[PDB]
Design a protein around this ligand. Structure first.
Ligand SMILES: *[C@@H]1O[C@H](CO)[C@@H](O[C@@H]2O[C@H](CO)[C@@H](O[C@@H]3O[C@H](CO)[C@@H](O)[C@H](O)[C@@H]3O)[C@H](O)[C@H]2NC(C)=O)[C@H](O)[C@H]1NC(C)=O
Ligand SMILES: N#C/C(=C\c1cn(Cc2ccc(F)cc2)c2cc(Cl)ccc12)c1ccc(C(=O)O)cc1
Ligand SMILES: [Ca+2]
Ligand code: NA
Ligand code: NA
Ligand SMILES: [Zn+2]
Length: 754
């Protein structure tokens, strides 16, 4: 067939026909025209139309939507958009027949956040978008910080474990097939989970342009094609579009990120951005369209010499498959190999050499903030690789990425410009999982269920169609008085300690609220321990095997010491720490059986140091802190609070469940001139989810004093409040002086320590 009059229509002539290798004979001839380049010149103005040209400077071009983007500048005495002053867009100004502002997502592979520092000298168009619209210092990608997991997260609002694109390469045991960047496999829909934006738009009557472009199509052509689609009549014209460039990723890989030879790739991108905004301007759409400039991840210095080889750790390297590079994923090469021992492989990869540039984890043991476990495509054995290094199986580029998503070099960019974004507004860094909701809002769509926190980015937008509401409590507490007698047992405040309201329990159970001089708790009669414990340590506070029963609680719903005596490997700790009692009288409350939780001795080293040393330090640095601590049960590693039937471990012979993790949420006043308990304004929060492990193999220095390794462990396991909420089915910060959207922003904050 032929593509005459069908080039880039919505034999094939569409922008993906190369990829599926299926275009017409003259697709290349007709559609990928390059003649005379991409720029109009004085001598071309009002030319007779010449069909061989790449773009046009004829009088009829605007109507066809196929002018070169500088046509009006060169041929009609108009200004480049970038040369125009910033002017506020208080409402969308759209041509006749437009019914919503269109969205254009301008995506740049490997665009590291720091690249913005290069500034309006190198990137004048981008810098104006940034300065004039809404921006953040950076945007955090998802882990693995690779292209495919991050593009589909942007599209879906989901963690890779949920959307299914767990890596650029993956093996699915159910399919028994592997997915790769190169190959036809990736086109099969079976790999792609969730509901991406283009489908959300279609299902709700909003027409979507294409989001993907064959590598063959030049960037200038991608822009021209989008601009031509925007000239289509109402019933044919999409409301949402995406541009993509493999730059500056491609050049990052060749030259590394910090090079002076990154200046030219960055100006070539800014040129394409300028083509887009000039193009929009001449179609009178530059104050109609919302534009998102966004990257998928950053870029780090990585060279051939900085490679760890598994062959130098494992004697049986030929019996394993490794997904290599800036992360590692290991599985048995052969199906029925009884010589395959993952316990042995992990031990063989643990703290073997002094400078070792990777750490092995079973996936359930990865920091919970990475949300990287609940998929059959994620191998049990993972290697978190040190920034600047690769790992390969056995023994041309200066850059790579893929590392832990809190690493500074992996951060990427966000800018929103247009009628629905705010004007000259800076917002705090946020995570790319949150954008799908925003893009939905920008298009009047109801988002499909996702991992963004809808409302947390309302501060990016001039107007908000979506108003978040706090979830309703699913179980009300009890407030027991003395209902029992010491002889009963066979064992063997608010103003001070609860500063943001009681956490709401969002599932069916039975729990009691408990008051004490030093702390308040919500005790669960199902799990035989608190779901949370809340206490406040003032800046100027002091640090200095009794277990006694709790009168307010039936022996039926209390733990016993005998169970710990009998469990050889399990000890116990306390959620409110005796070391922080206000008085020796108060201190006996800290030894109640209702304050007690099961802890491995190895973990007690971590927990005791946190409670006895770090909490004081934090209270000293931040002008007091409020701490809320508790247990987490996540045996199926889905990131969600477990029901009883999922719990796979109990204190021996008992019905006391063993937690997979212990959390803390540590809050103070952002205005540190105010104490934590007398804070008028915005809050400051840091949180962790510590794995409750029977050894400290994760910490290669753990034979040293706790001051040399505990805090590093805790920083690695930093978390968002939101992460803890999912894991506990609790809702926090319900009674503050702040708006609920502001609190949603606060619950999504991650303290990174970078
Ligand atoms: C990230 O967001 C996703 C999507 O909201 C969450 O995954 C969803 O999790 C729920 C709870 O397990 C699943 O609900 C189940 O849905 C099926 C119907 O498909 C129903 O038969 C079950 O009774 C239950 O209601 C849901 O399928 C699942 N959706 C997706 C796309 O995975 C996920 O939990 C979030 N992750 C975190 C850590 O918050
Ligand atoms: N086109 C393209 C390609 C990728 C991307 C297309 N978009 C646009 C986008 C925007 C918003 C959104 F929700 C989802 C997607 C991207 C956006 C980001 Cl942030 C990252 C990567 C990409 C691409 C296509 C083919 C090939 C190949 O090897 O054949 C390689 C890459
Ligand atoms: Ca769970
Ligand atoms: Na014991
Ligand atoms: Na150790
Ligand atoms: Zn990428």
């Amino acid at each position: 067939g032929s593509c005459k009059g069908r080039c880039f229509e919505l034999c094939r002539c569409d922008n993906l026909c190369k990829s599926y290798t299926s275009c017409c004979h003259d697709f290349d001839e007709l559609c990928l025209k390059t003649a005379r380049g991409w720029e109009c010149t004085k001598d071309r103005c009002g030319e007779v139309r010449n069909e061989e040209n790449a773009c046009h400077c004829s009088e009829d071009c605007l109507a066809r939507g196929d002018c070169c983007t500088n046509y009006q500048v060169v041929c009609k005495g108009e200004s480049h958009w970038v040369d125009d002053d910033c002017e506020e867009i208080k409402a969308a100004e759209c041509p006749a027949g437009f019914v919503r502002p269109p969205l254009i997502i301008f995506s740049v592979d490997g665009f590291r956040a720091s690249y913005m520092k290069k500034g309006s000298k190198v990137m004048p168009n981008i810098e104006k978008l940034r300065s004039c619209g809404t921006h953040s210092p950076y945007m955090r990608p998802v882990y693995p910080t690779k292209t495919f997991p991050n593009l589909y997260t942007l599209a879906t609002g989901l963690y890779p474990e949920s959307h299914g694109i767990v890596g650029n390469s993956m093996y699915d045991p159910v399919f028994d097939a592997t997915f790769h960047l190169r190959g036809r496999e990736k086109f099969n829909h079976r790999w792609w989970g969730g509901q991406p934006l283009w489908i959300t738009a279609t299902k709700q009557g909003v027409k979507a342009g294409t989001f993907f472009w064959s590598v063959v199509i030049p960037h200038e052509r991608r822009i021209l094609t989008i601009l031509q689609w925007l000239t289509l009549p109402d019933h044919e014209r999409p409301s949402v579009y995406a541009f993509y460039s493999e730059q500056p990723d491609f050049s990052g890989h060749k030259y590394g990120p910090f090079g002076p030879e990154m200046t030219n790739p960055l100006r070539e991108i800014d040129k394409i951005v300028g083509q887009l905004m000039d193009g929009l301007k001449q179609l009178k759409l530059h104050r109609c369209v919302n534009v998102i400039f966004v990257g998928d991840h950053g870029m780090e210095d990585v060279t051939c010499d900085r490679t760890e080889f598994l062959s130098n750790y494992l004697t049986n390297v030929d019996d394993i498959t490794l997904v290599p590079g800036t992360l590692g994923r290991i599985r048995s090469k052969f199906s029925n190999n009884a010589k395959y021992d993952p316990k042995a492989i992990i031990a063989a990869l643990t703290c073997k050499k002094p400078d070792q540039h990777f750490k092995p984890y079973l996936k359930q043991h990865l920091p919970k903030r990475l949300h990287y476990a609940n998929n059959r495509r994620i191998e049990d054995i993972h290697l978190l690789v040190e920034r600047r290094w690769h790992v390969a199986r056995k023994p041309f580029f200066q850059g790579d990425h893929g590392f832990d998503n809190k690493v500074n070099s992996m951060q990427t960019v966000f800018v929103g410009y247009g009628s629905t974004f705010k004007y000259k507004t800076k917002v705090p860094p946020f995570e790319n999982i949150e954008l799908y909701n925003v893009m939905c809002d920008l298009l009047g769509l109801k988002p499909a269920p996702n991992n963004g926190t809808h409302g947390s980015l309302n501060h990016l937008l001039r107007t908000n169609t979506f108003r978040p509401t706090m979830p309703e409590e699913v179980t009300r507490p009890n407030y027991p008085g003395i209902m029992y007698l010491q002889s009963d047992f066979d064992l063997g405040t608010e103003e001070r300690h609860l500063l943001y309201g009681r956490p709401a329990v969002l599932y069916r159970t039975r729990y009691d609220i408990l008051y004490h001089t030093d702390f308040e708790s919500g005790y669960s009669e199902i799990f035989l321990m608190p779901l949370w414990t809340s206490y406040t340590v003032s800046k100027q506070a002091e640090v200095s095997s009794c277990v006694r029963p709790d009168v307010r609680v039936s022996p039926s719903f209390s733990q016993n010491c005998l169970a710990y005596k009998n469990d050889k490997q399990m000890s116990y700790g306390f959620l409110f720490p005796p070391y922080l009692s206000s008085s020796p009288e108060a201190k006996y409350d800290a030894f109640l059986v209702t304050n007690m939780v099961p802890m491995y001795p190895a973990f007690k080293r971590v927990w005791n140091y946190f409670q006895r040393v770090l909490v004081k330090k934090y209270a000293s640095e931040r002008n007091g802190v409020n701490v809320i601590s508790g247990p987490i049960f996540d045996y199926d590693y889905d990131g969600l609070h477990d029901t009883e039937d999922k719990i796979k471990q109990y204190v021996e012979g008992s019905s006391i469940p063993v937690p997979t993790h212990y959390y803390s949420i540590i809050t103070s006043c952002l205005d540190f001139t105010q104490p934590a308990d007398k804070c008028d304004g915005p809050l400051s929060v840091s949180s962790f989810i510590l794995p409750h492990r029977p050894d400290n193999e994760e910490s290669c220095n753990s034979s040293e004093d706790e001051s040399k390794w505990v805090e590093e462990l805790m920083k690695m396991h930093t978390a968002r409040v939101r992460d803890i909420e999912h894991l506990t089915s609790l809702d926090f910060f319900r009674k503050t002086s702040r708006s609920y959207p502001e609190i949603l922003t606060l619950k999504t904050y991650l303290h990174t320590y970078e």
